[PDB]
Amino acid sequence: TTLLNPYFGEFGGMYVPQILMPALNQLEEAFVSAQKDPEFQAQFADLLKNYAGRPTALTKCQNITAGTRTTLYLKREDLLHGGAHKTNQVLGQALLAKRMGKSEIIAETGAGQHGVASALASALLGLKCRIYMGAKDVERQSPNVFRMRLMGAEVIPVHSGSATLKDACNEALRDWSGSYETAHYMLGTAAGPHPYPTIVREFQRMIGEETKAQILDKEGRLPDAVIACVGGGSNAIGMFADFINDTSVGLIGVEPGGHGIETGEHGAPLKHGRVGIYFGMKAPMMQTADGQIEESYSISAGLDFPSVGPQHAYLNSIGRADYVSITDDEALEAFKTLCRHEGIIPALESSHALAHALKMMREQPEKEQLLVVNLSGRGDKDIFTVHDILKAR
Amino acid sequence: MERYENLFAQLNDRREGAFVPFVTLGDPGIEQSLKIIDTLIDAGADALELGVPFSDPLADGPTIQNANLRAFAAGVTPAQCFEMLALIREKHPTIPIGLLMYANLVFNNGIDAFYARCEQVGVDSVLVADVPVEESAPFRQAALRHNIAPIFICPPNADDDLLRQVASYGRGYTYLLSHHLIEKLKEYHAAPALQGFGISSPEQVSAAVRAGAAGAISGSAIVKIIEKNLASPKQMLAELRSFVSAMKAASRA
Ligand SMILES: O=C(NCCOP(=O)(O)O)c1ccc(OC(F)(F)F)cc1
Ligand SMILES: O=C(NCCOP(=O)(O)O)c1ccc(OC(F)(F)F)cc1
Ligand SMILES: O=C(NCCOP(=O)(O)O)c1ccc(OC(F)(F)F)cc1
Ligand SMILES: *Cc1c(COP(=O)(O)O)cnc(C)c1O
Ligand SMILES: [Cl-]
Ligand SMILES: [Cl-]
Ligand SMILES: [Cl-]
Ligand SMILES: [Cl-]
Ligand SMILES: [Cl-]
Ligand code: NA
Numbered sequence: 001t002t003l004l005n006p007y008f009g010e011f012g013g014m015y016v017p018q019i020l021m022p023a024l025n026q027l028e029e030a031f032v033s034a035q036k037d038p039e040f041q042a043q044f045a046d047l048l049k050n051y052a053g054r055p056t057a058l059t060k061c062q063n064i065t066a067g068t069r070t071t072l073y074l075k076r077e078d079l080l081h082g083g084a085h086k087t088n089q090v091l092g093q094a095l096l097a098k099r100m101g102k103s104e105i106i107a108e109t110g111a112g113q114h115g116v117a118s119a120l121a122s123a124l125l126g127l128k129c130r131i132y133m134g135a136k137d138v139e140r141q142s143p144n145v146f147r148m149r150l151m152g153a154e155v156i157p158v159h160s161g162s163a164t165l166k167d168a169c170n171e172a173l174r175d176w177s178g179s180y181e182t183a184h185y186m187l188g189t190a191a192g193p194h195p196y197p198t199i200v201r202e203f204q205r206m207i208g209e210e211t212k213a214q215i216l217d218k219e220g221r222l223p224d225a226v227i228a229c230v231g232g233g234s235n236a237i238g239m240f241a242d243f244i245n246d247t248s249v250g251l252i253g254v255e256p257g258g259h260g261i262e263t264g265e266h267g268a269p270l271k272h273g274r275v276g277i278y279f280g281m282k283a284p285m286m287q288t289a290d291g292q293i294e295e296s297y298s299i300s301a302g303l304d305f306p307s308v309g310p311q312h313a314y315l316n317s318i319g320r321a322d323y324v325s326i327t328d329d330e331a332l333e334a335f336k337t338l339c340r341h342e343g344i345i346p347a348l349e350s351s352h353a354l355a356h357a358l359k360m361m362r363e364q365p366e367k368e369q370l371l372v373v374n375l376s377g378r379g380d381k382d383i384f385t386v387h388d389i390l391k392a393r
Numbered sequence: 394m395e396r397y398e399n400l401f402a403q404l405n406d407r408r409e410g411a412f413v414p415f416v417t418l419g420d421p422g423i424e425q426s427l428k429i430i431d432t433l434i435d436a437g438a439d440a441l442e443l444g445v446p447f448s449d450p451l452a453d454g455p456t457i458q459n460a461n462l463r464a465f466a467a468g469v470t471p472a473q474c475f476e477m478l479a480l481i482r483e484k485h486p487t488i489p490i491g492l493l494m495y496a497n498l499v500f501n502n503g504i505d506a507f508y509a510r511c512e513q514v515g516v517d518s519v520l521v522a523d524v525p526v527e528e529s530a531p532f533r534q535a536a537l538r539h540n541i542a543p544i545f546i547c548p549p550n551a552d553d554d555l556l557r558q559v560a561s562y563g564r565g566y567t568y569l570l571s572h573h574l575i576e577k578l579k580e581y582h583a584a585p586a587l588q589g590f591g592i593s594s595p596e597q598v599s600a601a602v603r604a605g606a607a608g609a610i611s612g613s614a615i616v617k618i619i620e621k622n623l624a625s626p627k628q629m630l631a632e633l634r635s636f637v638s639a640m641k642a643a644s645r646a
Contacts (some may be wrong), residue, residue: 001527013528014525014527014528015496015523015524015525015528016523016525017452017522017523017525017546018525018526018545018546018547018548018555019526019546019548019570021525022550085475160455160458161448161449161458161462166448166449167449170451171450173451174451266575276500276501277496277497277500277523278449278495278497280523282500287497287501290470290471290498290501290502291471291497291500291501291502292447292448292471292497293448293449294448304561391569
């Protein structure tokens with residue numbers, strides 16, 4: 001039995017070996033308790049305000065929209081401590097771990113941002129943090145690895161399988177199945193087995209709550225659409241959650257198109273993968289015809305989780321949210337555009353969301369539309385990537 | 394077919410436990426895997442547990458992860474696994490054959506079609522490693538519709554509700570992880586228990602049976618002999634033969 005529904009329509013669930021079920025059940029009980037505890041809420045809100053810097057700004061982009069009938073705002077998760085939205089939910093999950101009397105955190109990371117977010121939350125709250133990272137990733141994300149180690153986390157390179165994110169996920173879970181009495185597994189997106197899609201949404205929902213308050217204050221109405229990139233689904237579901245019941249507000253999720261959907265080299269499982277069961281959940285994923293799990297490809301490594309959160313698959317199926325893709329080249333153009341016209345360097349992840357909004361504006365410049373893009377992170381980390389591409393051109 | 398029921402009845406008559414090797418199909422290649430399996434049987438394996446190579450074998454340790462990698466290096470696919478299974482059953486009509494599967498391979502071309510394929514090639518049971526009993530309904534129903542026993546892990550800390558579910562839903566045998574659980578399972582009329590995980594010596598086989606389990610499963614110990622002897626397939630088979638013979642002897646009355 002569970003306290004909460006582990007499924008969103010046919011998607012989600014708890015597809016883990018039997019030995020991990022007590023860990024998930026314990027976590028669900030702790031979360032349900034925490035959500036009813038005003039003291040927990042107050043402590044979380046306090047860290048978000050006074051450590052992470054919430055609320056984040058909502059910035060209008062007149063320079064980009066000039067001469068069209070689009071009004072565009074960026075929700076500034078790039079201004080959160082750590083430079084990306086991932087900080088919100090790691091602080092909530094670190095508090096949950098403390099609530100459960102856990103003194104140790106396990107996390108996975110691919111492009112290193114969840115690793116850094118987990119390490120900073122663990123440093124603040126005095127937890128012993130160990131991070132699993134595919135050896136290939138350890139090699140290509142040395143700045144992030146160095147950050148994790150500065151913050152006192154142990155970074156464990158994963159050699160098994162293909163030595164990437166999914167192998168790091170597997171090592172984290174194997175460890176947790178043995179250590180869950182004393183360690184919490186701080187999963188890095190709104191995916192994996194229940195209760196993680198639910199917990200991560202709830203600990204990111206202030207993105208959309210704030211956006212709603214700020215847009216009402218500045219424009220006196222709700223947005224026509226909110227737009228967010230979708231790697232695993234956390235920043236998008238955090239922006240979307242408070243608007244789900246506002247049926248006039250469009251919810252647009254942007255998966256990475258990589259070199260183009262037709263090339264096969266993309267990271268868009270929701271719209272171009274096939275439902276499977278892996279990562280503890282039933283969800284669309286990148287997989288071979290005979291059911292071996294594959295990789296997502298994007299210029300942005302942070303969008304490379306090869307499946308997607310089950311609530312996104314559900315919101316798509318019922319037509320409440322629409323999902324699209326943006327290619328590497330479109331993301332690069334949006335990155336350049338924001339730097340030049342607003343003086344903001346966006347994460348290449350977030351640049352996928354911005355690119356779609358720019359398309360919405362440019363394709364129909366006399367359409368009245370009030371848009372919010374979730375600017376999930378800053379793009380300092382991407383300047384070498386962008387430099388190298390632009391130089392080879 | 395009731396191959397597990399028949400085996401356990403026969404073993405019971407002989408006051409004997411089952412010894413059940415675990416190997417990965419197609420490790421280290423198709424032809425050598427078939428030989429390995431024939432060797433395990435000819436050395437006295439009572440039943441088999443066989444893994445289908447999967448990209449992300451979460452619930453397996455390094456030895457078996459490596460076995461999967463070896464099989465993939467040989468280009469082994471689930472389709473090839475099913476061809477091997479048919480050939481194995483064709484050679485060996487009575488030995489119970491159980492698969493250790495991950496959910497995606499079962500769900501991939503449709504859960505019903507997967508179990509129908511198991512029935513066609515003469516498999517007896519399927520343990521889906523990453524389907525907990527709480528979410529097993531479509532799997533165990535499809536299994537039973539196709540005369541396949543669904544196998545469930547019973548963890549050493551299992552609570553009473555979990556014991557009751559495992560006893561009700563499982564068939565063939567209960568997979569018990571390494572005397573109280575054994576007695577509760579018997580109380581709740583569960584399928585006979587096989588003890589698995591870290592069984593690597595005759596003494597542990599004997600201990601499992603003495604505790605009241607119907608037998609013991611060994612995988613890492615067996616696959617290590619494969620890994621050890623990759624360069625010498627002939628010696629590989631001799632060493633497998635002597636190890637299985639010793640382990641089987643330890644189950645005898
Ligand atoms: O996408 C995931 N992690 C995000 C890592 O973020 P980053 O450091 O930016 O790669 C992620 C991790 C685990 C997972 O489920 C399960 F645990 F079952 F494997 C699903 C998704
Ligand atoms: O089976 C396990 N251990 C070793 C036995 O397998 P193998 O050594 O491959 O025969 C094993 C280890 C961890 C586990 O939990 C989870 F996968 F979720 F992390 C489940 C099973
Ligand atoms: O039978 C298995 N392994 C062989 C016996 O263990 P060992 O001798 O230690 O390799 C075996 C059974 C189940 C399993 O996954 C899960 F537990 F989740 F269901 C993994 C390995
Ligand atoms: C990790 C990351 C993402 C992608 O993860 P989601 O869970 O899909 O939000 C997006 N933007 C930034 C800046 C990230 O660091
Ligand atoms: Cl508020
Ligand atoms: Cl309000
Ligand atoms: Cl106003
Ligand atoms: Cl200018
Ligand atoms: Cl029952
Ligand atoms: Na994805």
